[PDB]
Amino acid sequence: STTSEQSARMTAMDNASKNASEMIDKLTLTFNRTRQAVITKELIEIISGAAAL
Amino acid sequence: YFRDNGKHALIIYDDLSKQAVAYRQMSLLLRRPPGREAYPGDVFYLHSRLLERAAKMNDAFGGGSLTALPVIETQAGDVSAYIPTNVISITDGQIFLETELFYKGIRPAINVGLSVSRVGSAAQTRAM
Amino acid sequence: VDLEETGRVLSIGDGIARVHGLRNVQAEEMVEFSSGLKGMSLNLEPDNVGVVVFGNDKLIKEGDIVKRTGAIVDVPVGEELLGRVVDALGNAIDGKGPIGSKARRRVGLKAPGIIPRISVREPMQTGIKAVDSLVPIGRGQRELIIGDRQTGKTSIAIDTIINQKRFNDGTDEKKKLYCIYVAIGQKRSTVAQLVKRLTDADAMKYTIVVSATASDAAPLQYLAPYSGCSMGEYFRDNGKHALIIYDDLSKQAVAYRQMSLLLRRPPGREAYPGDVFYLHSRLLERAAKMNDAFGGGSLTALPVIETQAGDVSAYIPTNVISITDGQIFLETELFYKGIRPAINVGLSVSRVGSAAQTRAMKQVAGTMKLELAQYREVAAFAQFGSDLDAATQQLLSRGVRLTELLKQGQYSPMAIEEQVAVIYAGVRGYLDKLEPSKITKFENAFLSHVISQHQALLGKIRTDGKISEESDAKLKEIVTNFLAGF
Amino acid sequence: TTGRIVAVIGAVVDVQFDEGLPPILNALEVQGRETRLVLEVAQHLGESTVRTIAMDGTEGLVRGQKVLDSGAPIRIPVGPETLGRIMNVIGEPIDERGPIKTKQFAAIHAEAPEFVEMSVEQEILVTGIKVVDLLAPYAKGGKIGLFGGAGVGKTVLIMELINNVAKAHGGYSVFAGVGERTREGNDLYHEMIESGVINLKDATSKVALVYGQMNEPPGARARVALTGLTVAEYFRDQEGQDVLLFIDNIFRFTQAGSEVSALLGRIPSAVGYQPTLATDMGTMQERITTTKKGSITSVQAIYVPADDLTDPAPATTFAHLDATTVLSRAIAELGIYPAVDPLDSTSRIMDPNIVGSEHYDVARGVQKILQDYKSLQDIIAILGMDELSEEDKLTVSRARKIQRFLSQPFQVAEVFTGHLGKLVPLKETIKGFQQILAGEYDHLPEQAFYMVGPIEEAVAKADKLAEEH
Amino acid sequence: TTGRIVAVIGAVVDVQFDEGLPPILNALEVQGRETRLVLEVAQHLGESTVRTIAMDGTEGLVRGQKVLDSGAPIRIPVGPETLGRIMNVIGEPIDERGPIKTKQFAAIHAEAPEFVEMSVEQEILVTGIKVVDLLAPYAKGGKIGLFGGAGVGKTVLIMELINNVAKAHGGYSVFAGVGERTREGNDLYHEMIESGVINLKDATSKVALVYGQMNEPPGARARVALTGLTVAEYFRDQEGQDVLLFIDNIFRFTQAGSEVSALLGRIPSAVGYQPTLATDMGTMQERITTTKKGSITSVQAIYVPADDLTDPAPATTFAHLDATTVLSRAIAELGIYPAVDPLDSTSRIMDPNIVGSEHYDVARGVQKILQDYKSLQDIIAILGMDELSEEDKLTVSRARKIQRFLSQPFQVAEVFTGHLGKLVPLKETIKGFQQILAGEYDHLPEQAFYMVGPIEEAVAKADKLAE
């Protein structure tokens, strides 16, 4: 049972690490999209204020 | 011209994501108020008016036709970006070309899970 | 009435006078208002002139008369400034009398070209073990110090300034290094306590503190770095070695942004004008190392940047990261878990590299860098610690000791030979049999011991600049004997 | 001189003159108003026009009204008569007790002390709060900041500091409330009157309230800070005595400037703030200072919009303080009050030379153990806590004990907690934290330390919990 | 004709002509400067005024200074006498070595070769570097990204490419250091002089250096790439040969364009980049092609902002890259040089039609075996080596031998390795890797392959290391 349990923990933590990395892929893509959106939005606000006056 | 003279045509815009960028340049240089991703609010009418001409006239109008195959290019495969959704709501289908199926040597890389054709079974050879 | 050498203010407000006349005024020229106020003419438009006022616009009414001084901004220079506290234009603000400098220079002069320079090869000793071994700084370099709030950047700068006292009190002349500390946008009491701190360590007989504090008008804060860099170019162009510390360069950017947005120039990203790169690049490109045909002098620069939330992809942080020859990250997470100076040695770099390290420190830090690199990639296990082979166990037992050697205290820089001795003891392996918590004590003891008895060995290391096998053996013997009786 | 209003837009009034032109910062009185409306000049647009910010609502103004240039910036009463009163931004009293009859008037705009006038001494200022005294000790004559989100404890903490220090202070005091609730201003006024700090009958008051609460149009919220600062300036210089100066909030001083900026004709900066944010704040924060001829122990509450310490406003203020105690919402959610964040509050006197070796070692030990606990929580995410080694379960237990022990009950919070407010002298805090770190209390439950003063009280509370068990 | 400076706002100067305006992009010389300030026209504001961007500092410009219209865009000397000479955007020599004497002058604002001039067959530039020429082959008239920052061998790789192309093709090279640190520019100059690609005596230099410094106004850093293209276009058309064109950095080109557009007062695009980012990149990248006279192959160092490959700058750049070379630190540590990462490196012409069936199959085989070894490295690191089949151990041996075989000695890095440099021709590389994969050399030691040229040289080393 000890050998089986250790092999199972190896497999389970390997699967958990792979799931976490596969999730970080999507989260990083979303983070970059949102960062660019924030930069664009702030810039548009500034230039729209500048034009309005 | 062909469509209205009873013939059949096929037009492949390649890409339509690089026309919307030229239009964004034109607008921003005209000082028009940028919108979402700096695209002008007009960036839809630009593609809708272009792709609404890919019609199929009935026999009382010659019977011609004009198929269209716009090619859009998505950064990091974000199907939910602005222009990709602008065009996904103008067209009659879609062929998603995954970049990981392609890297597996599975070419052409159509992602049959997401690809669809909203005329589909109609206009398909019975044998096929 | 004269409308070529003289003009009259059409408008004023928020520090940006709009003058009418001054047809012969040059761009970036210093005009003078009727109220004893100076100003710098930045915008030359067909109908008016945009003058940024060096001071308060309360004294600049409409209709005032402005007369052009005929000269671009210039600052005094010389060894008459050393030990003084000047403001962004050379005026003393320490109340010790007039500066009395014969020479002058233009703030906006251009950097040396491609041929005058020569590759950076001398070591600029910062007296901090982490910096001097893992992220070394040569003479003629531009090493950014980039960090968060209250992580210890100004302390790195002041330790560097204080350390040079050992060289400046000697007789060797090509090791003397003169420091300049440009303090931009800082509460005056901070600068006063800093000047007191430098006086305490007696490091204020070769330091020039240029002060452009928070109350000062935006142009003075935009102009202070250039004043300091000119007072430093004076030492560069006379066979002397200088070290200018801008603190910060983000606040110069903020002041410049205010000036631009009030002159109504196209905003750009984060409202920064389009010249916040040109602004900093044409400043940091004046840190050079002239070849012997031009005197051989040099001018190091240590711009300090604050990053909000460790965000080093912001506008100005990236502008100044792509201009400089390295960076010394100072993370707060490390600051609070004992690692002080909190120099994150993974992100820190020096594109100059070990080309600017003394042969002894090269000999030792070359392997210390690899040991820490190996430790950093099995740091996660540190908690588990057990359950792992002897390989990673020994890796992260050497890494912990090496890390605890790099801890250091406020205002107590170490001579290069002493850093070499400590790192030698630590990395050759004469410490792996010691509980980590005691390492520091050992250091603080061993150091003193070596300072007392074996001064001759330290002198030989300092002069030869290398660990000769004879010196290597003697040092091994010293370490073994001391570690035996601990 | 005498001009005539030419345009009104929001709180920005453009006034045209035919006589001489009033220099910037002057105060102009609008003729024909039931209540004194004062316009502060802010620009010269040419053609003998000046743009101005109205210190009071611009309702009912008519193009062409007459405006008289007072000839000098907003002048306010000062002296030991303003003690115990309440003042407008423009100095006129708002506590309904007759005029403030002084000999001295001061202009609210004045240059800051020169570099040759600063002090360089620092001596810890015991406040009776464990966390503040232990990790970020305050300093006499220093500037102090309380960075908080919304509803974390800035105002309760500053009331605690008032109650503690202002009551036990030889010198005077000033409380400039810039653009915060009027309910709070009234509450403070009544608390002081009922606590003897203010005295309505005789001349024995030690506080000079000034109020620009959040119903005042932006021109007023952006200047009452300067008015309180002028009163404190006088007490620092002319009286030649120590002073306290509590400001709450100092964010509104920036927010009001942002509100008027756009109408003043300025392109907006990064986050909608005025382009002049940094300098408009330096010209103020540089007058709040100790000098060789006085001493001001300024404390300032600072809103942090949306708990974003990277916002331009708090980010810029951080450089103007000698000590910051960043209240945190996450800690306040755990119930620890005050919510001060131990790993984000800093100080300039936290050195082994200024506070002593043992104080410094204990403060750094507390910080290091809390940081280690923060790192361990990540592992506890996955493993659970039974799996942690036996050198770390001790670390987690000790860190939880220290977190609880940093909490304290204030005398002004008896309404919420019900407990009794306590003051913990410095020695008690240092000794208690030394002992908690050393392990002399591994046998008491952590909840024994929750909301207690000195360590002996934690021992007594543990005993009482055991007995009642 | 002479106009008069009417306005001077930062780096933007508005000049007023009276007889006739100069067409956009012309160069104007301000009269009265100790140095030579050149303004490039950018707009026609009307009322005979033109808004222009300065190539140098505009300090000291009076409102009224006389400005002489040169009569054509910035013109530079493009003879074969440029080689070995540093020059800046406006064409002056910045190495204080005397004027650049040429009989030819070229205007830096040209247009892409027309459609008819385009070459239709896709060739393969042979750089002589095994890893570059096998896994990520370079294409004549193609753009090549170069990732990897410092400490990895970027400069040594650039020098080796310069040398090999000048030696095995007779074609010179241009190095347009856009946004070049002065310290790094001087270091590169001296490294080249030491390594022989530049020679200050015998007039046989193989490189023309153009430097747009980092302290020049944006109007200058945005045009130096065009000066490099002008020199290289001369070498292609008027001398009919293949050319190399190094652009370090290509991000700083887009950034300089962005600052210029902001200065002129144009609404910023998506993420603050200029609205004209796509066509600003296109006009430049579209002159690097293989016409019917010759070809320009551009190696463009690329910086990715915020580690974001979808950022508008790299997103626009990657639409033009014909290949990618990823220098990685993790392979300089292992001692393999050049550090080129065999797996991250890609190429558009890894197509059996373009490079051929045998070349494609060999490259695919090497990639497959290297991926397999990468996957098995984890298992070896976890379950231990003793539990791998015979086939797994054989693939590990093959993969280690291939890894070591990709390393090569460079004629310009002799002083480091000491080994005499080698230039492996394409066919010999394909033969060597075919043989290694087929198993012909399962009976040789790993170190027999480290830092050797052809495979036969590896066999010679294997013999000499057992004698």
Ligand SMILES: Nc1ncnc2c1ncn2[C@@H]1O[C@H](COP(=O)(O)OP(=O)(O)OP(=O)(O)O)[C@@H](O)[C@H]1O
């Ligand atoms: N090497 C060190 N050892 C111990 N403490 C240090 C060290 N360096 C800095 N500190 C502590 O960190 C605190 C902040 O230091 P410092 O002023 O150098 O940071 P800073 O970045 O300059 O702050 P700010 O950003 O507010 O100007 C100081 O109180 C100091 O005691």
Ligand SMILES: Nc1ncnc2c1ncn2[C@@H]1O[C@H](COP(=O)(O)OP(=O)(O)O)[C@@H](O)[C@H]1O
């Ligand atoms: N020391 C404390 N003890 C108990 N509760 C507190 C304490 N400090 C703050 N609180 C609670 O948090 C709330 C925060 O309000 P307060 O601090 O007065 O305003 P601010 O939003 O300016 O911080 C209080 O209403 C109170 O209920």
Ligand SMILES: Nc1ncnc2c1ncn2[C@@H]1O[C@H](COP(=O)(O)OP(=O)(O)O)[C@@H](O)[C@H]1O
């Ligand atoms: N083929 C090689 N042989 C030996 N050393 C190399 C080789 N390639 C790179 N290096 C080493 O890597 C270092 C990288 O420096 P270099 O590439 O010249 O500058 P950068 O890192 O800026 O590109 C060099 O000092 C060199 O010694």
Ligand SMILES: [Mg+2]
């Ligand atoms: Mg600092």
Ligand SMILES: [Mg+2]
């Ligand atoms: Mg409150």
